[PDB]
Ligand binder design. Structure first.
Ligand SMILES: *[C@@H]1O[C@H](CO)[C@@H](O)[C@H](O)[C@H]1NC(C)=O
Ligand SMILES: *[C@@H]1O[C@H](CO)[C@@H](O)[C@H](O)[C@H]1NC(C)=O
Ligand SMILES: *[C@@H]1O[C@H](CO)[C@@H](O)[C@H](O)[C@H]1NC(C)=O
Ligand SMILES: *[C@@H]1O[C@H](CO)[C@@H](O)[C@H](O)[C@H]1NC(C)=O
Ligand SMILES: *[C@@H]1O[C@H](CO)[C@@H](O)[C@H](O)[C@H]1NC(C)=O
Ligand SMILES: *[C@@H]1O[C@H](CO)[C@@H](O)[C@H](O)[C@H]1NC(C)=O
Ligand SMILES: *[C@@H]1O[C@H](CO)[C@@H](O)[C@H](O)[C@H]1NC(C)=O
Lengths: 596, 201
């Protein structure tokens, strides 16, 4: 009869047939990931093509129902999600060119092999070995060689490709009634139609700048401390007044600073909280790791894992004969099938990763009651944030003492808290200016603020201004230095990490206030608290049915992303860094004072 | 006296194949001895919810006829086989009256009714113009008209085929795994009651 009833019946038919097609596709992808064989690749490709063609046909059918004659919010949300053209609005020649460009960038990044001139008999690919060289070497010219050679080869290959990519994506986005591709990416956080809880695409940039302005003093103090320690490590290269050299940050691009913990440790003489030896002494299997994670989730009141999870997940490396992807991934296959694919070792990192991925699984299980097209996070930030909060809670010394992995007579003094907080800052605080600068640069490129002949002059200028990192030697426009990273070269949004980082500490403060923790925020554990689990599960059960602002109201009581919980988390470290930076100079100069 | 001629519960519970919920099988059970303690004391049933009568007095009371309806549904849809419930199964597939006397027996059948490729031999009605009356069977395969336009027998836009297949797989969750449901309906009519319980010696 009415348009709304027609859309509801169409959505029922879509949900039922999409769930089965998505299951078949997901199972084919799982069979490829646990068994890398050519027939599995072919089956995966066939299932993916069927799924994509089905989504195209259903979107084409879905557009015939006008949005403004539907009043139910959930039905309108599913219809809005389905009615996106994607690349379908673009012409077939340009769509094929865009798909070819994306595939060839994926092959260039994945199969990019670079080695030293005059010694070309064997070469090293980035994923197998360049990571170890960037993370462990202490030689200035070796790291300079690796960094410049990889940006030379990858950037000189990817620069025309990226120039075509920006134009094609902008054409698709303006064909889809967006200002640019940056607006298309910012449309994930767009909330329309809810009174008071509306969020605009243009508000995201303003909120990111407003939060980063409060991030900036903590990052400046951390940068000054890291600069002083790197000056100790490398005596003459680093200037007291200038930016950090780009190739010395411990990773290939500067994404994380977590590989500088050895060089920049405050109290090396004091012990670490490493629990690897304790699990080795007690013979902890990977099954025991996941059972302890399940015990953590049942302690807070969340549902326990299904029988199908224990039967169908691969929690151990299969063997030499069978090949599998080593990356830890939680799979929501559909229809109540939840699995974890992780090559779990007996390490602290794998144990924390197990907590993180089981948090992903709990988030996936919670919105199983929702319709198929609403089975996602409210935004891209929440899905990662709910795993990161479990990673935060499990890493605490209280959790380790509670589960028996740490000695009950372990002395928790201020120095261990300072060095642990510094490690967490190098992982968490250090990625924030890089993430913000990268997303702001991509937004300005898509918006047309930066012309193609001035991309790199602005980019290094942005990096000196925001990240406080200087280029080793100047680069002209023949280089494509941003696209050497995985996310930008393969068409992925990058603001999810910034939003995830802020949502992580907002959720942590909300659950710790719920759990009646009476100390520092980093000393807080959310186990044994039913009310904290209930407050989490209220947001978890919604999925994408409700706006992310309303979900954030459900957890923290705020309608917007906030920066104060992060600053509260690192407040002991902030005072310690302010004490340690009395002699040194906080802040950097954008001039070429260290090296250029 | 010595009792023989038991009611055929082997051909209902232990059937090699069950019907779809849209075309649920109804077997009228008459003129035999119904031993209900065999069913109640079995550990193989997940749901044995009796409405309107208690299991303890089943082996004593006597009824004129017993209606055994058999079908397969999902795990999450077992709750809808009850008086007063709402859902796809209750509205469009199998409707129970509010004044229902009988028992709903359900058990997991992932072992038999699920294959690795997907078992699509079980169908359920997804759309109907109106809700079903109690104990009604709809086996019509006419195209559902959701819009003003005539369907003309072809599944196009706003016109959908009402019967949709379940895709049972052995790796599914417990809420999506196949459950075989047998509903026993007990009525007393003015005719001489012949389905009586076993008499102790
Ligand atoms: C992985 O693929 C090989 C190739 O045929 C197959 O023999 C093997 O059974 C597969 N592994 C599993 C666990 O099914
Ligand atoms: C929207 O539709 C759903 C069914 O998909 C229904 O359960 C819900 O109550 C509706 N909401 C409103 C406000 O009508
Ligand atoms: C998708 O593309 C078609 C083709 O031009 C257009 O008519 C339709 O409005 C587009 N959908 C949206 C939501 O813009
Ligand atoms: C999960 O919890 C329920 C209720 O406590 C229990 O019956 C079930 O056996 C548990 N699942 C597993 C796999 O232990
Ligand atoms: C730890 O506490 C002691 C006792 O007040 C103090 O002397 C020391 O400076 C503190 N160290 C740090 C790193 O805060
Ligand atoms: C949480 O509950 C479990 C079960 O009683 C207990 O073993 C554990 O010690 C508790 N956690 C804390 C921090 O007391
Ligand atoms: C049905 O099968 C089960 C399992 O083998 C068996 O124990 C039972 O006796 C059979 N018959 C009935 C009426 O349940």
């Amino acid at each position: 009869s009415t348009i709304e009833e027609q859309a509801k019946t169409f959505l029922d038919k879509f949900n039922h047939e999409a769930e089965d097609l998505f299951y078949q596709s997901s199972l084919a992808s799982w069979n490829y990931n646990t068994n890398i064989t050519e027939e599995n690749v072919q089956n995966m490709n066939n299932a993916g093509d069927k799924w994509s063609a089905f989504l195209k046909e259903q979107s084409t059918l879905a557009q015939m129902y006008p949005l403004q004659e539907i009043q139910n919010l959930t039905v309108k949300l599913q219809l809005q999600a389905l009615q996106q053209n994607g690349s379908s609005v673009l012409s077939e020649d340009k769509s094929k060119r865009l798909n070819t460009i994306l595939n060839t960038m994926s092959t260039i990044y994945s199969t990019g092999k670079v080695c030293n001139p005059d010694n070309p008999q064997e070469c090293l690919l980035l994923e197998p070995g360049l990571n170890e060289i960037m993370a462990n070497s202490l030689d200035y010219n070796e790291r300079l060689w690796a960094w410049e050679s990889w940006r030379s080869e990858v950037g000189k290959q990817l620069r025309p490709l990226y120039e075509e990519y920006v134009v094609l994506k902008n054409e698709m986005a303006r064909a889809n009634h967006y200002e640019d591709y940056g607006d298309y990416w910012r449309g994930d956080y767009e909330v329309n139609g809810v009174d008071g809880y509306d969020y605009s695409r243009g508000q995201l940039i303003e909120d990111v700048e407003h939060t980063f302005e409060e991030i900036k003093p903590l990052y400046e103090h951390l940068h000054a401390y890291v600069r002083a320690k790197l000056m100790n490590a490398y005596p003459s290269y680093i200037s007291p007044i200038g930016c950090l050299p780009a190739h010395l940050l411990g990773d290939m691009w500067g994404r994380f600073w977590t590989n500088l913990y050895s060089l920049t440790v405050p109290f090396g003489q004091k012990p670490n909280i490493d629990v690897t030896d304790a699990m080795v002494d007690q013979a902890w299997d990977a099954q025991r790791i996941f059972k302890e994670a399940e015990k953590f989730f049942v302690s807070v009141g969340l549902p326990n894992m299904t029988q199908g999870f224990w039967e169908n997940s691969m929690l151990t490396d299969p063997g030499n004969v069978q090949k599998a992807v080593c990356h830890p991934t939680a799979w929501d296959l559909g229809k109540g099938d939840f699995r974890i694919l992780m090559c779990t070792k007996v390490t602290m990192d794998d144990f924390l990763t197990a907590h993180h991925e089981m948090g992903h699984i709990q988030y996936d299980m919670a919105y199983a009651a929702q319709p198929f097209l609403l089975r996602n996070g409210a935004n891209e930030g929440f899905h990662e944030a709910v795993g990161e909060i479990m990673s935060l809670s499990a890493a605490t010394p209280k959790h380790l003492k509670s589960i028996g992995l740490l000695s009950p007579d372990f002395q928790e003094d201020n120095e261990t808290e300072i060095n642990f907080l510094l490690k967490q800052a190098l992982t968490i605080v250090g990625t924030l200016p890089f993430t913000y600068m990268l997303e702001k640069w991509r937004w300005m490129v898509f918006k047309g603020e930066i012309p193609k002949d001035q991309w790199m002059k602005k980019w290094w200028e942005m990096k000196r201004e925001i990240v406080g990192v200087v280029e080793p030697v100047p680069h002209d426009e023949t280089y494509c230095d941003p696209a050497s990273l995985f996310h930008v070269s393969n068409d992925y949004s990058f603001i999810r990490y910034y939003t995830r980082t802020l949502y992580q500490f907002q959720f942590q403060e909300a659950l710790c206030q719920a759990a009646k923790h009476e100390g520092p925020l980093h000393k807080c554990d959310i186990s044994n608290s039913t009310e904290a689990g209930q407050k989490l599960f209220n947001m978890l059960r919604l999925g994408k049915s409700e706006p992310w602002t309303l979900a954030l109201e459900n957890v923290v009581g705020a309608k917007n992303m906030n920066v104060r919980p992060l600053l509260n988390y690192f407040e002991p470290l902030f005072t310690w860094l302010k004490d340690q930076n009395k002699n040194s100079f906080v802040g950097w100069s954008t001039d070429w004072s260290p090296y250029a | 006296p010595n009792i023989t001629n038991l009611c055929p519960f082997g051909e209902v519970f232990n059937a090699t194949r069950f019907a779809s919920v849209y075309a649920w099988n109804r077997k009228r059970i008459s003129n035999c001895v119904a031993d209900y303690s065999v069913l109640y004391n079995s550990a193989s049933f997940s749901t044995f919810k009796c409405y309107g009568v208690s299991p303890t007095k089943l082996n004593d009371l006597c009824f004129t006829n017993v209606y055994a309806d058999s079908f397969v549904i999902r795990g999450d849809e077992v709750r809808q086989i009850a008086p007063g419930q709402t859902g796809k199964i209750a509205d469009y597939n199998y409707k129970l009256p509010d004044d229902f006397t009988g028992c709903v027996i359900a058990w997991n059948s992932n072992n038999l009714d699920s294959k690795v490729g997907g078992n699509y031999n079980y169908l359920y009605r997804l759309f109907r113009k109106s809700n079903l009356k109690p104990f009604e069977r709809d086996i019509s395969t006419e195209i559902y008209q959701a819009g003003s336009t005539p369907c003309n027998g072809v599944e196009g836009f706003n016109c959908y085929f009402p019967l949709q297949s379940y895709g049972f797989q052995p790796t599914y969750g417990v809420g999506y795994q196949p459950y075989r449901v047998v509903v026993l309906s007990f009525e007393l009519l003015h005719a001489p009651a012949t389905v009586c319980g076993p008499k102790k010696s």
